[PDB]
Amino acid sequence: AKLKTRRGAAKRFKATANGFKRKQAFKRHILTKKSAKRIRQLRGCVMVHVSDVASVRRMCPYI
Amino acid sequence: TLRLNELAPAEGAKREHRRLGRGIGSGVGKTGGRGIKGQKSRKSGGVRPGFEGGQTAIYRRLPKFGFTSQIALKTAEVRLSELSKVEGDIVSLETLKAANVVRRDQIRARIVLSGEITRAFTVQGVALTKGAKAAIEAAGGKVE
Amino acid sequence: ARVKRGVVAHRRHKKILARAKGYYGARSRVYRVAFQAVIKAGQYAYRDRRQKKRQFRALWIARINAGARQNGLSYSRMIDGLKKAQVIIDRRVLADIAMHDAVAFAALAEKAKGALA
Amino acid sequence: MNLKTVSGSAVELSEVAFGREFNEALVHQVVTAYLAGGRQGTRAHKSRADVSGGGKKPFRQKGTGRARAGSIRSPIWVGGGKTFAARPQDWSQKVNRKMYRGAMQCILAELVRQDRLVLVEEFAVAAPKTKELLAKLNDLNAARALIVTDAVDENLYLAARNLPHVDVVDATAIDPVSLIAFDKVVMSVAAAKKIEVELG
RNA sequence: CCACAAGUCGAGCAGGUACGAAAGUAGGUCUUAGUGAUCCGGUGGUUCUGUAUGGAAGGGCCAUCGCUCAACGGAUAAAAG
RNA sequence: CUCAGUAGCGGCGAGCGAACGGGGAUCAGCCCAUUAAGUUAUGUGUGUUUUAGUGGAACGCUCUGGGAAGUGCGAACGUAGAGGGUGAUAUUCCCGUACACGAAAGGGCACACAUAAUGAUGACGAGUAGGGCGAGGCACGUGAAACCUUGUCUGAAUAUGGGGGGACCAUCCUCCAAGGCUAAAUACUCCUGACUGACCGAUAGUGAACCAGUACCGUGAGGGAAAGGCGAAAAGAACCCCUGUGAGGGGAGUGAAAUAGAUCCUGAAACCGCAUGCAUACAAGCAGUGGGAGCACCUUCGUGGUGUGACUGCGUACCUUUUGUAUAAUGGGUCAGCGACUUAUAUUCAGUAGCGAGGUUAACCGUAUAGGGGAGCCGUAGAGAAAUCGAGUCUUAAUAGGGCG
């Protein structure tokens, strides 16, 4: 049959020109104690690590 | 030459398939490359992809973000060079669809400066970038 | 495309048994026991092809020693004397001469002791 | 190119259809594809679940001293099911249209080079009698050969039906295996022109 | 510094400040412990989206709130002999 | 067949999974009591097809052979050289094959027409639509849940009207529920006729090639085997001898062949006899291996060949599992036969071939591996959650700085 996508991963990963982008953790609820530098630097998107690129490729074949 | 018993494939076209468990000399005898014992040695022994031994998975320890846009599915992007496939001087959504550069179910199209054009065109109801418009004018076309 | 194994399997077993002939009991009659016997025979042959050179060198040295002590020298002293005299005849030829010709071996011993002194 | 017909006249043919270089790998792939498409692929075997009986456990798991068994139709046992039972198969391969046409062009060019293709101004039979066709083919020195015509006359078809090593075909029905199998190809000028227009 | 997820130090630029006559100092406290991922839901903004159209509902984005999930990389929301 | 594993659903886990739009196959509408299309049964006529069948061409000599269809030399038929048989391999020996021809009687199908019934207790749709409560179905788990069915309690308006367009309001668009009938494209094979197979060939293939769902087991439901082969033709051994008028043999005879003699083609291995040559009853162990005297036979007598092996150095089987096995750790009484990485689909990388900024069709039509079919897919542009812009784009008050290109 056709390969099926892992929708949970598809909702966390998007494709770039040469790789995959992702959001960062530790920014949801507990924030008062965290410093301003951490608050600002954890914002935005980052790139998926090469070691973990293979699993993302397996879980998201068509993206 | 030109006989049924004188026809051969190209070098490197065909490779013998690998057969496991057919003697010591083959090099894949007995265990057949699976190793010794364990889950992976058993039949259907692979674990599910994305399973890391119990630790929270990569796709589950990261946050969800974004939402899907409906109009983006029907929006179409067209390279400048593809206008050569168009038959005639009038470039429109219908003409692009006829030339098969835009799928039938799309509702609007955009033209971007990607290639080169050596013809004169008149664009009707299609969005143009600054560079694409400049290229069309240079080639001798018009808009609207 | 069904394939029968009988002819090829029989040929292989027959060849092994033929190589096994001359052994005792089940070793020359039963394929399972016979196959083990052939392999061990090959391994022994591989080891003995090396052991043979040592055994024959020891035999030559013993015969040379007997001849030398008949002529009044020890084997080591005769070998040293011959080396000093620059004689390059090997131990196999020296042993053959010692066994088959006493006069020539006596002449060789004379030369060796002359070189020694 | 100018090709001489048997009588002596000259016929002009396209270089593309009859002048292409010989590509052995391409021709081999196309011919193998045709041979594979020739298969029927009808058969089957019974697996351990298709053999009669075998529902129950033969004997208890422990205490008997035998080897543990679950069913008498296990593939290890005599009379059991086949480990990997076959099912009917389709052996057709997809051959690219351009590769097919290129292979036909190569075959025609190589036949022309080897001089096994003879062009005739016309080729027809008055009556559906085998002996007349045999005499004609002997006169042409093409006793064992494949005849290619623009259209197949019923009389010629009947006359050639019973001749071994001789078959007759229309220009639109040539196939690469038949082009190679026969010793010679006797082709009329009209069939040559039609095949040239088809460019393969 | 680190298998990953994470963690740590930081010259320097723009804006608005406080203290100095001024050069200038200040992006929490001499430093190394005082902690909790993801899902779900609440609150303040939002030039984003809004299933025919205009709105609205709902969704997204920025900030932030609810776990002794202490078996502290946290099987299920809920489990003894 | 695509759209698409997309949009969505989901202890947002594991998993489940659409529609719109496009391309094909087929193509058809007709009625509610002045009663339609269509269907069914009976009877008549015009075409067509079946249930037995008939004719059907053309080879001689020579050699091997038990036997000719096989060798060598030449000849004939072919709208026929498909297939089977005949003492070994046959287009011309037989049955047949292409072709032509054939039905007293009965049966099937297509159409036309004459009657029966049927459609049809049905004349514009009220316990109806809608709502509260509990459930079920829709890709969708009550979730912002739109839409369909209802167990229970209720309950309208009725063309100046009503349903839907995914909570809901207004506008706009579209349609007319609470009454019905209707062929083709679609699904399958207990059976019938023909044809086919890079399907099996007696441990295979149906459990069953043979008197098999039998023998046999069980109270019963039920379970369930093994077992093919003389020879071309029985020409299947008249008669004699031993023996119990037995069995079993020996001679004679048949046959191309009788260790082809009737559990009868070939007749392997394990296992068990007889005969010949060498060794062997003072010497301790995985039985061999490297050396090596003597003996018997054959000898081109040789520095040879075939059997045997007194005496001697070295030397504790195989597999599995283990840090490590002669291990007193596991498995194997022996032989013959069978016995375990496959197949379909999707995807990724490599090799190879075609074409090339382009490449390629799917279903489907098609006396069909051809030809047609461009819907669709991949590539040719990224950034951003998104609007949007675009060789740039996001962040920001910032043309600064920075991320991805």
TrEMBL record, chain C:
Keywords: Ribonucleoprotein, Ribosomal protein, RNA-binding, rRNA-binding. The gene is rplT. NCBIfam families: rplT_bact. SUPFAM superfamilies: Ribosomal protein L20. GO terms for cellular component: ribonucleoprotein complex; ribosome. This is Large ribosomal subunit protein bL20. It holds the Pfam family Ribosomal_L20. InterPro entries: Ribosomal_bL20 (IPR005813), RIBOSOMAL_L20_CS (IPR049946), Ribosomal_protein_bL20_C (IPR035566). GO terms for molecular function: rRNA binding; structural constituent of ribosome. Binds directly to 23S ribosomal RNA and is necessary for the in vitro assembly process of the 50S ribosomal subunit. It is not involved in the protein synthesizing functions of that subunit. It comes from the Bacteria. Gene3D superfamilies: 6.10.160.10, Ribosomal protein L20 (1.10.1900.20). One of its GO terms (biological process) is translation. Belongs to the bacterial ribosomal protein bL20 family.
